[PDB]
Amino acid sequence: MTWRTTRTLLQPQKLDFNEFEILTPLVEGARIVGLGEGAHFVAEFSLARASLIRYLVERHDFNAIGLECGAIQASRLSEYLNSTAGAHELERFSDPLTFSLYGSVLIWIKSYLRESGRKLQLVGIDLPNTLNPRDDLAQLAEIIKVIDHLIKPHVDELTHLLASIDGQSAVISSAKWGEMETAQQEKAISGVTRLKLRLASLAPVLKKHVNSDLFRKASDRIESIEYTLETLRIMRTFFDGTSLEGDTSVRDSYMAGVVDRMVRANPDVKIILLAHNNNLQKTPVSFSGELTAVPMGQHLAEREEEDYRAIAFTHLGSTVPEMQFPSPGSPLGFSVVTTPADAIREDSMEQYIIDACGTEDSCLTLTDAPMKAKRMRSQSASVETNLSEAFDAIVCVPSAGKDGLVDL
């Protein structure tokens, strides 16, 4: 009664909506539903995401999708979705990491929206997934020029101070960050704090009608830059030295903040969050070099509205695409290589799926029932937690092959 074999999950065009009825109670009253992935860059996880987007959109009226990219990165993706009059390939509207993480789903979404006539809001809930603050600072400088020109030299100094942060991924940008002198780093961090406090102090004036929503956009840009610099500082310790336990919660708390603000600002929004299992999880995550981090989902599970749900995706394959770091010569500082996935053990969610659904097709299970499962695959490893508290449901596909458009 709490599990279901789904034969159509990997076939979004031939979906049998009866197979997802098990989710209808948990999705009622939800305004935020996360669709996970146990590993990035997996073809089957993009397929399952497209199917569950169909279910949430067509049967529960979800109307927005949030991605692990920045707000400006996402506006370009929105241009892609809405375009048609010319050569409008996704490569023209996306950066390399965004393309590999979401390209397959994004190409499908555009067709789906055109053919179905439906409409969805795209939202970047993240920092720039490059950790390059250039776009944010450039938009801030244009806004500030209009609404608070007195502080425009300060924004332009910041732009110059941070011009060398131009990577296409966190590992590249963080390496460029570590090449700056400590005093220039702290001067930039202090510069952003000065700007943040000035803008908040002037809010009653800058919210005047002639400025439209420019105060809000400036405030969002500054927040994005502030957390980008702190995440660059952390990413540096997270390999090159003294990473403090819990520090990797900072980026995920930014994401939780963007989602929370967006939902309470727009009360009709019902958003589907496309993020990793480790980000959607509602309990503390222990993984790789982090003894314990607080995930985005644990913040969102705090909402008094109790309207967040998290669906983890896992798989029964013997291998999984993994990120290989370091990877000298690779354009983004890492590569994606097929590697053996973590062994399935008796107290694993994977074994429960095998015991419940079998191994023939995919499986969908709720987590609120006594069970032996305490660990679940994540990348080529596993995380251990209380899975009834950590996720609301689990989606498990038969295999996890590298997505064919991923070029890393």
Side-chain angles (χ1 to χ4, degrees), residues 2-13 15-20 22-156 158-237 239 241-242 244-303 305-408:
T2 59
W3 58 272
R4 178 67 152 91
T5 293
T6 167
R7 312 202 189 271
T8 69
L9 176 74
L10 304 174
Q11 307 189 33
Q13 271 57 250
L15 207 65
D16 175 2
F17 284 88
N18 300 287
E19 303 185 322
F20 308 95
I22 180 185
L23 306 173
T24 289
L26 78 82
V27 169
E28 310 172 331
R31 295 189 54 196
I32 306 147
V33 174
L35 304 174
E37 50 180 13
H40 290 314
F41 313 122
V42 172
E44 289 86 353
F45 289 150
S46 293
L47 279 171
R49 282 177 159 179
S51 288
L52 281 165
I53 289 163
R54 274 201 72 198
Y55 166 74
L56 292 168
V57 165
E58 298 177 17
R59 292 294 189 83
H60 293 278
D61 271 294
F62 275 70
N63 51 38
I65 296 189
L67 314 166
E68 298 183 74
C69 60
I72 294 172
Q73 283 179 310
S75 59
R76 302 184 178 115
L77 297 178
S78 285
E79 281 186 78
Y80 164 72
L81 289 184
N82 297 306
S83 75
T84 177
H88 289 160
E89 308 82 34
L90 172 65
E91 287 92 335
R92 299 263 164 74
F93 300 84
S94 57
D95 307 301
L97 177 65
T98 298
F99 183 84
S100 303
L101 280 168
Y102 296 113
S104 283
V105 170
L106 284 166
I107 296 161
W108 172 83
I109 279 174
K110 178 175 186 175
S111 309
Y112 173 66
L113 294 180
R114 169 176 66 254
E115 289 163 12
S116 81
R118 301 168 167 282
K119 299 282 202 300
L120 296 183
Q121 187 180 346
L122 264 194
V123 178
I125 67 172
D126 207 348
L127 309 169
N129 57 33
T130 56
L131 303 184
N132 177 355
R134 187 202 65 245
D135 286 346
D136 286 312
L137 287 148
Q139 186 196 134
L140 178 60
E142 300 166 354
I143 293 163
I144 285 304
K145 181 206 143 36
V146 178
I147 78 176
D148 185 30
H149 195 280
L150 289 168
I151 205 84
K152 172 119 159 55
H154 182 91
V155 169
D156 289 314
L158 276 175
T159 310
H160 286 108
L161 254 166
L162 303 160
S164 79
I165 317 300
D166 62 7
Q168 281 286 349
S169 73
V171 48
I172 306 307
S173 296
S174 64
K176 295 273 216 118
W177 173 259
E179 282 161 17
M180 296 179 53
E181 288 294 295
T182 294
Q184 350 182 244
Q185 296 172 339
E186 283 167 351
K187 177 182 289 295
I189 289 166
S190 300
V192 166
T193 292
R194 189 263 203 270
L195 262 164
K196 184 186 142 87
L197 272 41
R198 177 181 170 84
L199 268 276
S201 82
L202 297 178
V205 170
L206 300 175
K207 286 177 190 175
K208 65 173 109 183
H209 172 92
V210 67
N211 289 347
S212 180
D213 61 350
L214 295 181
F215 166 76
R216 194 267 304 159
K217 293 183 166 176
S219 306
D220 292 354
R221 297 297 90 72
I222 293 158
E223 286 300 301
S224 180
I225 294 150
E226 175 194 44
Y227 276 78
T228 293
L229 299 195
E230 172 61 7
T231 293
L232 287 166
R233 183 198 70 77
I234 292 162
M235 263 51 253
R236 270 303 292 183
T237 62
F239 327 110
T242 39
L244 208 55
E245 172 182 57
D247 262 2
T248 62
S249 319
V250 162
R251 176 186 150 257
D252 274 49
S253 72
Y254 177 82
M255 288 193 288
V258 170
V259 171
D260 192 71
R261 288 203 291 290
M262 204 228 63
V263 153
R264 46 213 320 141
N266 313 272
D268 272 24
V269 166
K270 297 171 67 167
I271 187 161
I272 309 168
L273 304 182
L274 300 189
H276 199 277
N277 285 3
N278 296 1
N279 303 115
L280 299 179
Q281 189 168 312
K282 303 186 289 191
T283 61
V285 176
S286 172
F287 183 84
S288 200
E290 175 68 86
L291 283 190
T292 295
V294 175
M296 171 193 67
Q298 185 170 0
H299 294 267
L300 294 178
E302 291 202 300
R303 282 170 54 82
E305 301 89 326
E306 297 184 29
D307 59 1
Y308 173 64
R309 311 287 185 263
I311 311 182
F313 286 27
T314 190
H315 69 91
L316 305 186
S318 63
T319 64
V320 69
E322 179 61 284
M323 290 170 283
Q324 183 179 247
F325 169 85
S327 164
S330 70
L332 278 43
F334 67 96
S335 283
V336 174
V337 300
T338 299
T339 206
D342 198 28
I344 296 161
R345 298 174 196 88
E346 183 179 354
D347 56 10
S348 77
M349 178 59 56
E350 291 75 22
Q351 183 66 57
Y352 181 89
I353 294 298
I354 293 168
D355 297 342
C357 279
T359 66
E360 170 140 74
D361 285 316
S362 307
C363 181
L364 179 55
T365 190
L366 311 174
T367 57
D368 185 13
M371 72 185 148
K372 295 190 295 198
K374 278 173 175 69
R375 57 193 90 252
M376 184 163 54
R377 293 172 149 180
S378 173
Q379 296 303 125
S380 62
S382 296
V383 306
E384 168 160 19
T385 190
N386 181 318
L387 292 159
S388 58
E389 301 201 310
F391 299 96
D392 294 277
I394 318 284
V395 171
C396 183
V397 302
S399 56
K402 176 164 64 49
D403 189 328
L405 63 66
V406 173
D407 201 8
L408 301 186

